[PDB]
């Protein structure tokens with residue numbers, strides 16, 4: 355539950371994502387661009403149903419409003435990153451006490467989409483879909499390794515807690531055990 359906001363790697367990690375989501379390349383991000391790239395495009399790649407897609411959009415809107423984003427508001431990287439620092443810090447207090455968080459809520463919405471065979475758990479077969487998120491579809495070996503990093507109790511399947519912990523580790527805390535989650539194309 356400790357952050358590493360001054361690590362050049364955490365800064366670069368978010369700059370990479372900011373640049374990617376910045377559809378028109380102008381160095382300013384809007385909630386509009388974020389919803390298009392982080393919600394519409396992602397749900398399409400995952401073959402989410404309309405209901406799952408709309409739920410995911412609600413979670414993305416809430417999450418990024420938590421970072422200071424809004425429709426029509428162009429925000430530069432330093433302000434965007436400060437939004438992330440503030441949200442991570444406030445959410446980590448809640449996470450520590452099993453209280454509701456925007457990041458877990460987003461995790462819930464994505465988990466439902468990955469959990470296709472309808473089971474409440476994600477198995478290795480289903481985890482393949484995670485590779486569709488980033489631009490580099492993982493090797494089979496890397497798919498297994500990222501699954502292993504998530505599967506903390508080695509049960510052979512993931513629950514929402516396990517997936518969310520890795521997502522939070524990647525984006526909030528720069529958790530070394532979450533490194534590699536998205537492959538080498540996402541630093």
Ligand SMILES: O=C(Cc1ccc(O)cc1)Nc1ncc(-c2ccc(O)cc2)nc1Cc1ccccc1
Pocket residue numbers: 367368369371372391392393396460461462464487488489517518521525536540
């Ligand atoms: O990674 C996901 C999907 C997800 C998986 C697990 C989970 O618990 C919650 C969500 N979404 C996501 N989660 C986070 C961010 C993200 C992270 C940092 C940032 O500055 C902006 C967006 N973006 C995205 C979309 C995306 C697009 C392209 C490549 C990777 C991811």
Ligand SMILES: [Ca+2]
Pocket residue numbers: 376377378379380381382383384387
């Ligand atoms: Ca832009």
Ligand SMILES: [Ca+2]
Pocket residue numbers: 468469470471472473474475476477480
């Ligand atoms: Ca399942």
Ligand SMILES: [Ca+2]
Pocket residue numbers: 504505506507508509510511512513516
């Ligand atoms: Ca498990």
